[PDB]
Amino acid sequence: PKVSVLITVTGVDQPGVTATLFEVLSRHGVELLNVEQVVIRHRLTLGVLVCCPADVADGPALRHDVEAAIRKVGLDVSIERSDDVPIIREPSTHTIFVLGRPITAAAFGAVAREVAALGVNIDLIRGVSDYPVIGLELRVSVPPGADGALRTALNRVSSEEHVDVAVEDYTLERRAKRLIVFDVDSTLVQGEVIEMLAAKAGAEGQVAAITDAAMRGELDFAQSLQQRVATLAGLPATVIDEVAGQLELMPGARTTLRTLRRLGYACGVVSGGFRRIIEPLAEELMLDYVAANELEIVDGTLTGRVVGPIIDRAGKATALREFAQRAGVPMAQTVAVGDGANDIDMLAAAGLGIAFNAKPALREVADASLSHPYLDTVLFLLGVTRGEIEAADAID
Amino acid sequence: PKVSVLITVTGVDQPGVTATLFEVLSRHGVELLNVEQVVIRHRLTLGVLVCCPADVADGPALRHDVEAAIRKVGLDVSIERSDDVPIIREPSTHTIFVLGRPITAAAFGAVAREVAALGVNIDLIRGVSDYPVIGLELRVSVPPGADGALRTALNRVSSEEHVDVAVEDYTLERRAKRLIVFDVDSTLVQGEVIEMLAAKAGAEGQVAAITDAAMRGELDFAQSLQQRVATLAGLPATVIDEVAGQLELMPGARTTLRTLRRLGYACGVVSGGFRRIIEPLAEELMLDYVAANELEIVDGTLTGRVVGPIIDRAGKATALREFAQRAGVPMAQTVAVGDGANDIDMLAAAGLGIAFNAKPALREVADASLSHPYLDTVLFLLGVTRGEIEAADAID
Ligand SMILES: [Mg+2]
Ligand SMILES: [Mg+2]
Numbered sequence A, B: 001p002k003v004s005v006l007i008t009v010t011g012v013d014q015p016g017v018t019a020t021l022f023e024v025l026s027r028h029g030v031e032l033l034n035v036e037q038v039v040i041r042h043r044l045t046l047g048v049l050v051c052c053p054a055d056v057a058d059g060p061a062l063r064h065d066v067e068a069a070i071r072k073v074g075l076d077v078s079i080e081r082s083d084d085v086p087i088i089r090e091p092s093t094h095t096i097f098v099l100g101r102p103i104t105a106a107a108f109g110a111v112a113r114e115v116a117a118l119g120v121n122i123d124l125i126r127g128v129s130d131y132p133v134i135g136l137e138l139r140v141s142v143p144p145g146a147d148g149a150l151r152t153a154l155n156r157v158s159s160e161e162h163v164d165v166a167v168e169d170y171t172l173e174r175r176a177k178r179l180i181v182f183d184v185d186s187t188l189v190q191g192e193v194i195e196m197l198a199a200k201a202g203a204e205g206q207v208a209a210i211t212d213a214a215m216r217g218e219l220d221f222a223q224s225l226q227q228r229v230a231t232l233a234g235l236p237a238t239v240i241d242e243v244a245g246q247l248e249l250m251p252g253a254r255t256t257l258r259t260l261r262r263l264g265y266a267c268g269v270v271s272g273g274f275r276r277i278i279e280p281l282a283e284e285l286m287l288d289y290v291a292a293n294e295l296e297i298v299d300g301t302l303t304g305r306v307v308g309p310i311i312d313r314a315g316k317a318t319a320l321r322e323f324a325q326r327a328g329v330p331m332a333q334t335v336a337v338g339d340g341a342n343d344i345d346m347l348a349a350a351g352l353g354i355a356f357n358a359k360p361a362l363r364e365v366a367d368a369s370l371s372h373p374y375l376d377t378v379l380f381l382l383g384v385t386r387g388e389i390e391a392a393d394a395i396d
Helices: A017-028 A060-071 A103-118 A147-160 A193-201 A206-213 A219-231 A240-246 A253-262 A274-286 A313-327 A343-351 A384-392 B016-026 B060-072 B105-117 B146-161 B193-201 B205-212 B221-230 B238-245 B253-262 B277-285 B312-329 B341-349 B386-394
Strands: A006-011 A031-040 A044-049 A076-081 A095-101 A120-130 A135-140 A163-169 A179-182 A268-276 A289-293 A294-295 A300-304 A332-336 A352-356 A368-370 B003-012 B031-040 B041-051 B076-081 B093-101 B121-131 B136-139 B163-169 B179-182 B265-276 B288-291 B295-297 B302-306 B334-340 B352-356 B369-370
Touching: A006 A017, A006 A060, A006 B076, A017 A060, A017 B105, A031 B031, A031 B105, A031 B136, A044 B031, A044 B041, A095 A103, A095 A147, A103 A120, A103 A135, A103 A163, A103 A289, A103 B016, A103 B031, A135 B031, A147 A163, A163 A253, A163 B341, A179 A313, A193 A206, A193 A240, A193 A268, A206 A219, A219 A300, A219 B179, A219 B369, A253 A268, A268 A274, A268 A313, A268 B003, A274 A289, A289 A313, A294 B341, A313 A343, A343 A352, B003 B016, B003 B060, B003 B105, B016 B041, B016 B060, B016 B093, B060 B076, B060 B265, B076 B312, B093 B105, B093 B146, B105 B121, B105 B136, B105 B146, B105 B163, B121 B288, B146 B163, B179 B302, B179 B312, B193 B205, B193 B221, B193 B265, B193 B302, B205 B221, B221 B302, B253 B386, B265 B277, B277 B288, B288 B312, B312 B334, B312 B341
Parallel strands: A179 A268, A179 A332, A268 A289, A332 A352, A352 A368, B179 B265, B179 B334, B265 B288, B334 B352, B352 B369
Antiparallel strands: A006 A044, A006 A076, A031 A044, A031 B121, A095 A135, A095 A163, A120 A135, A120 B031, A163 A368, A294 A300, B003 B041, B003 B076, B031 B041, B093 B136, B093 B163, B121 B136, B163 B369, B295 B302
């Protein structure tokens, strides 16, 4: 097994090329060291590294046979002895997802600039969706220490150019994610249950004020929730059923969970809302775990307080950890998706922390930020493509 | 968002191309529909589908700008309006793994012939290992109903050309495999414990006869095991410790399990050997589950019989199923790796049934057959590459 020899075929794709090339190579004394091939928009590139004897390699026989056979039918072929060339490419270090509606060329351009500026090469680019959102994957190779810089760079690009840009490690380990938890209110579920409840009271205004203030940061969650729930004092606890079946799942939420089931994920929710309303829905969606606060009921009437302990911001993290343990999933292989500053400790604690249509407070400490009203775009940050979802769904 | 326009750049890779192309496209009115890119052996192919107005598209402005910018620095670019072209490629239907030592060009050729004969196209080829075994992945698109035929075709190729050839579904679901069970004897572990025990008795000959006969098919496993274990009557049960720490893990077994842990697999063994010898080792390798037969000991002496129930061929399947349930993994998302006709019901029952250096009896009903004395090659049939293993291992 003397010298290495590199055959590279390019040109417009045609049937039988791969087979024609290897049938030819078999007439000489050839063993395969590596093979790479792809067709992009009817452009073939076929890259073969072979290990033949010094006899066969430095002999005009092999060269003229391959050159005759490729050129005879359309394509081009180069042939060069190396003995200095890598056999099998090292893996990408990271992967970057770009989601937009639309993704302007200008947006994509800004991404590549920052990538190139920071010494990163692009190993591959592919699409991972067309609808509801255009999704593009770049698998990249990042110099050590550029990692902190590159996210910084791309996060400016994100806000400027109006696309979602996420950077994830492209490792074996941190790719086998297997536990995900969703916030409920304005994540898995359209809107805020507590405003829907406060509306029954006639207090949607007082509450939606404090509500859009606590999940933005201005108010402590505990003292906010007590002042918010208080407004419900007097309501008949049948209000909980009314608002429960008044709820609308976020766009794509069913698709999101179904696909997560297909991939064998443990799924659960961690909320500061109310078990009574949530558990009804978590049965429907076959959830593995629920953590919520609880409304104190006295003679079929809410008293405007809750039954401790309070799932506060620290509570959400603690609940993710407890869920991780019972299911036997390391923390780094866990995912959290939430929208408010409520969700800061949870997202930080999780392996991959995703902010969904989230207040600036969360979108500034989250691993990844989505900004379209489609929860299924969570799947693209987890390595899934639309075409895959679409395929799997069609076999029922 | 009028007509679609397809830009395709090819040529020898150079820094800044991706960015140069999109910076240019931003000066016109362009939104990205799809992007595909790869560099194989310094050959760039960049494939962009854009969605610009009828104004921009049918205007010589865009064409001359892109054409000037690409050609100015080395590469070629075509540009054609389509409005009839697919946006985002459908996924591969299956994936084929070719493992050899070596993989001759002739071997690879035979694979591509059968592929082409049966109407299948190759979407991608990449390497997934160089050592210990050359590994090559072909992601293919298979016409419906060709599936049964294609495995048939490639299985002849396998035996003729001296490579391992496996065909797996390339679906979302049947790719998220998460539970694997190994046979112990001549799978996870070098050799046969019961011959190592029978040797202590002075009965290696009588036993290795019947042993290499039952895991080939000629003898019923129960009546074989009773006649085999019988030969141990009289031995002091301290023999079990002696043979336990006389065992050698199959080449790569530690790497196999470690990687499986990284990927968050439940791992276990299902044996017709002896809990007393096996459990010692299963603690070491942090196994989630053990199923084995058990040696009847009377006053520190083996009696040559076992304590029922007997893990027979049907037992192994039943044990996999029980393991699947306790861990909450559907059967189709389970993996079994074994070597004897002992392992037929288990491998059939499993989602993916892998025969490892296995008797013809198993290698004729197993989903996939390996034939090299390296158990880590199990990982390549599970979508892992050497470079990935090598990367993950190096971060400790
Ligand atoms: Mg929230
Ligand atoms: Mg066996």
